[PDB]
Design an enzyme around this catalytic site. Structure first.
Site, PDB file in Angstrom:
ATOM      1  N   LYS A   1       0.840  -1.193   0.000  1.00 53.38           N
ATOM      2  CA  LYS A   1       0.000   0.000   0.000  1.00 53.38           C
ATOM      3  C   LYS A   1       0.860   1.221   0.000  1.00 53.38           C
ATOM      4  O   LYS A   1       1.968   1.185   0.477  1.00 53.38           O
ATOM      5  CB  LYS A   1      -0.908   0.034   1.244  1.00 53.38           C
ATOM      6  CG  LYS A   1      -1.569  -1.305   1.576  1.00 53.38           C
ATOM      7  CD  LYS A   1      -2.963  -1.171   2.191  1.00 53.38           C
ATOM      8  CE  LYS A   1      -3.525  -2.526   2.621  1.00 53.38           C
ATOM      9  NZ  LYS A   1      -3.618  -3.496   1.485  1.00 53.38           N
TER      10      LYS A   1
ATOM     11  N   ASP B   1       9.847  -1.159 -19.191  1.00 51.75           N
ATOM     12  CA  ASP B   1       8.403  -1.165 -19.086  1.00 51.75           C
ATOM     13  C   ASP B   1       7.811   0.186 -18.690  1.00 51.75           C
ATOM     14  O   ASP B   1       6.930   0.270 -17.840  1.00 51.75           O
ATOM     15  CB  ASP B   1       7.995  -2.222 -18.086  1.00 51.75           C
ATOM     16  CG  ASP B   1       6.537  -2.584 -18.196  1.00 51.75           C
ATOM     17  OD1 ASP B   1       6.007  -2.678 -19.346  1.00 51.75           O
ATOM     18  OD2 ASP B   1       5.927  -2.746 -17.128  1.00 51.75           O
TER      19      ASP B   1
ATOM     20  N   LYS C   1       5.376   4.017   1.346  1.00 53.24           N
ATOM     21  CA  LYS C   1       5.041   2.738   0.755  1.00 53.24           C
ATOM     22  C   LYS C   1       5.357   1.658   1.754  1.00 53.24           C
ATOM     23  O   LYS C   1       6.434   1.616   2.346  1.00 53.24           O
ATOM     24  CB  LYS C   1       5.821   2.509  -0.526  1.00 53.24           C
ATOM     25  CG  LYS C   1       5.428   1.254  -1.286  1.00 53.24           C
ATOM     26  CD  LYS C   1       6.227   1.169  -2.554  1.00 53.24           C
ATOM     27  CE  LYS C   1       6.170  -0.227  -3.142  1.00 53.24           C
ATOM     28  NZ  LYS C   1       4.808  -0.438  -3.662  1.00 53.24           N
TER      29      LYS C   1
END
Ligand SMILES: COc1cc(S(C)(=O)=O)ccc1Nc1nc2ccc(-c3ccc(NC(=O)[C@H](C)c4ccc(F)cc4)cc3)cn2n1
Length: 260
Positions: A23, A132, A38
């Site tokens: 989270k 990515d 985080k």
């Protein structure tokens, strides 16, 4: 609600990101300064996963010296059970902001481009290729974009893109991966910021999509627009042959980012 990290207490304002086992919370510390934290639960993380995490973290912590277009990491606590990372809090991520947005100021677009170039250039100088890239990897903080991750930590899944194919370069599909691969993906993000879609967004079928991406007999459309330099940037980033594709150091000298 509340959290402790390296002896300092943080109260939770809200949750601003999620995951299976992860989270992100917006929080305040003892001085009423705001931060993002985080949290990563390591309960079901294998060794390879764990090492991918520690590596991503080491890089974030290193590369902070080297560019202010990489998210700031002020502190972290890591144990066998969890990770907590204390970061500067951004306003929103680029993907969410793009979706909320009907037209982009040309100046704002050009300014975000530069920021993305700078951050990606920085990771390339330490030998990282992200491979990515997508809008969700960038964060708006004080009207600047900041890169938040390096493509190194293993990914997972419980506003949202992940496993998406719209930014994938041709040579990632065929699979070699070079810094040029990150240029394609930036190119796709710029195209979205220019034309309101990604270059293969209309091809619904995923396999048709992948085939179109590697097919040089499939022409990508670049509708005319008043900024000719932008249109040339897009054409140059989106060459399917990486040896033909412009490089980051070149894009930084391009008239689109230099002129006016
Ligand atoms: C109010 O702010 C908002 C709102 C909305 S929203 C809900 O409006 O769309 C959206 C956003 C904000 N803000 C925000 N601020 C920050 C600061 C930092 C990060 C952040 C930074 C780095 C990562 N890195 C990783 O996940 C990598 C892959 C990693 C690293 C270590 C591991 F162990 C495992 C994985 C992940 C998240 C995110 N945000 N997001």
């Amino acid at each position: 609600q509340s959290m402790s990290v390296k002896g300092r207490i943080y109260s939770i304002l809200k949750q601003i990101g999620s995951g299976g086992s992860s989270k992100v919370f917006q929080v305040l510390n003892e001085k009423k300064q705001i931060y993002a934290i985080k949290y990563v639960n390591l309960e079901e993380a294998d060794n390879q996963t764990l090492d991918s995490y520690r590596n991503e973290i080491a890089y974030l912590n290193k590369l902070q010296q080297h560019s202010d277009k990489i998210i700031r990491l002020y502190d972290y606590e890591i144990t066998d059970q969890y990770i907590y990372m204390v970061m500067e809090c951004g306003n929103i991520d680029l993907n969410s902001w793009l979706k909320k947005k009907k037209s982009i100021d040309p100046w704002e677009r050009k300014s975000y481009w530069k920021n993305m170039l700078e951050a990606v250039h920085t990771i390339h100088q330490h030998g990282i290729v992200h491979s990515d890239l997508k809008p969700a990897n960038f964060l708006i903080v004080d009207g600047m974009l900041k890169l938040i991750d390096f493509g190194i930590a293993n990914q997972m899944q419980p506003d949202s893109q992940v496993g998406t194919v719209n930014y994938m370069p041709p040579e990632a599909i065929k699979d070699k991966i070079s810094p040029k691969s990150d240029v394609w993906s930036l190119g796709c993000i710029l195209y979205y910021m220019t034309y309101g879609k990604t270059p293969f967004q209309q091809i619904i079928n995923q396999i048709s999509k992948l085939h179109a991406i590697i097919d040089p007999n499939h022409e990508i459309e670049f509708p005319d627009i008043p900024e000719k330099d932008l249109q040339d940037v897009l054409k140059c980033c989106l060459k399917r042959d990486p040896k033909q594709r412009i490089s980051i150091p070149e894009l930084l000298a391009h008239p689109y980012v230099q002129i006016q």
